[PDB]
């Protein structure tokens, strides 16, 4: 195992200075990552993996051979969110946050809509199989439920108006922040599910704050997505680029906001809207504390700008 380094993107989103307040290890907070699975025993991830599940072929399974990452994409994304702050490897945006690895994609990154919908449902139900155990209508942010507070989606496709979108809406309504990559084609707009108003579309910047040429335009926010070092199978590390590497930086930032807010107030913030410019919702706080790059205000390259955990948390707690 290599000595720990802090990847540049972790510093760019202003995560490390938040860790004296919270590293995300507030017990009610989980981040569900719907992706290719996880290297569940990776030494720089294992302690943060709260649930390792697969919904492949419509069967909910925690068997290790079903849930283990065969691609590497899920492992890398999970690492950016939650690699442990210790003596090895890398360190996540929220290096103390619990992770649900929900494998919805096979070795080749292929899956079916039904398995993705079941994966979203699993993130809401949590390991107990029940969305709202005490029936109070509080799901995300309820310490007596086990629902995830953030869902990080590594999918791209055309518009859906079916049971799948219905499931995304249920997650939003449960108070869960949903995050997805704008896409990697340099196209004029975000792919789905990033394009839904319930979901934060994330674009990619390089280390000089240039928008990446591959980053699909009109995102909601942007984040480090070029030359991103993170965990990779087997107990290893890899450097990748993509709006999909930008996405976990934002998920990690959301986890820090909700962990710090809950730690202070015993509740979480409402998710909010793409339009939001108040301090009263997660997305509001993300938008107003983002580094406004490019033309003043929201623009087609950067969205609201580059997310910043230090400023976001300060806003949330003040």
């Amino acid at each position: 195992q290599p000595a720990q380094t802090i990847p540049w993107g972790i510093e760019r989103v202003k995560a490390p200075s938040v860790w004296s307040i919270t590293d995300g290890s507030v017990s009610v907070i989980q981040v569900a990552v719907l992706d290719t699975g996880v290297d569940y025993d990776h030494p720089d991830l294992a302690a943060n993996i709260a649930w390792c599940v697969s919904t492949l072929r419509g069967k909910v399974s925690t068997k290790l051979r079903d849930c283990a990452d065969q691609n590497g994409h899920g492992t890398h994304v999970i690492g950016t969110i939650a690699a442990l702050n210790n003596d090895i490897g890398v360190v996540g945006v929220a290096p103390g946050v619990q992770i649900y690895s929900v494998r919805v994609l096979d070795a080749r990154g292929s899956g079916s809509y039904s398995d993705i919908a079941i994966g979203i449902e699993q993130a809401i139900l949590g390991p107990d199989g029940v969305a709202d155990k005490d029936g109070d209508g509080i799901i995300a942010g309820d310490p007596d439920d086990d629902a995830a507070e953030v869902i990080s989606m590594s999918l791209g496709g055309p518009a859906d108006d079916s049971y799948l979108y219905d499931m995304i809406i249920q997650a939003y309504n449960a108070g869960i922040v949903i995050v997805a990559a704008s896409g990697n084609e340099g196209a004029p707009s975000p792919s789905y599910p990033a394009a839904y108003p319930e979901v934060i579309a994330v674009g990619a910047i390089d280390s000089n704050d240039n928008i990446a040429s591959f980053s699909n335009r009109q995102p909601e926010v942007s984040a480090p997505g070029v030359d991103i070092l993170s965990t990779y199978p087997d107990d290893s590390y890899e450097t990748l680029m993509g709006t999909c590497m930008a996405t976990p930086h934002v998920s990690g930032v959301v986890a820090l906001i909700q962990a710090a807010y809950y730690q202070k107030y015993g509740k979480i913030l409402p998710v909010g809207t793409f339009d939001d410019i108040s301090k009263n919702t997660v997305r509001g706080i993300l938008h107003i504390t983002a580094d406004d790059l490019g033309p003043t205000g929201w623009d087609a390259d950067y969205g609201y700008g580059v997310v910043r955990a230090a400023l976001a948390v300060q806003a949330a707690l003040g």
Binding site: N71, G111, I118, S162
Partner: protein
């Protein structure tokens, strides 16, 4: 068999009737009124026709971004 996702009116749909047309239930969603079913491609008409069945979606491929 093909895999489909059925939107249902829970007040009228009878899931036990699925077996008769040669299908089986794969997963019943807890949070939306839908069920994934495997059904021979040719009972799809019979399925669409069953009481409480509102919509029949084919399963579609998702791809990693």
């Amino acid at each position: 068999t093909i895999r489909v996702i059925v939107s249902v009116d829970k007040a009228k749909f009878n899931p036990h009737e699925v077996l008769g047309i040669g299908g089986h239930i794969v997963y019943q969603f807890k949070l939306i009124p839908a069920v994934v079913v495997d059904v021979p491609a040719n009972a799809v008409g019979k399925l669409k026709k069953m009481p409480g069945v509102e919509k029949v979606e084919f399963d579609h491929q998702a791809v990693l971004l």
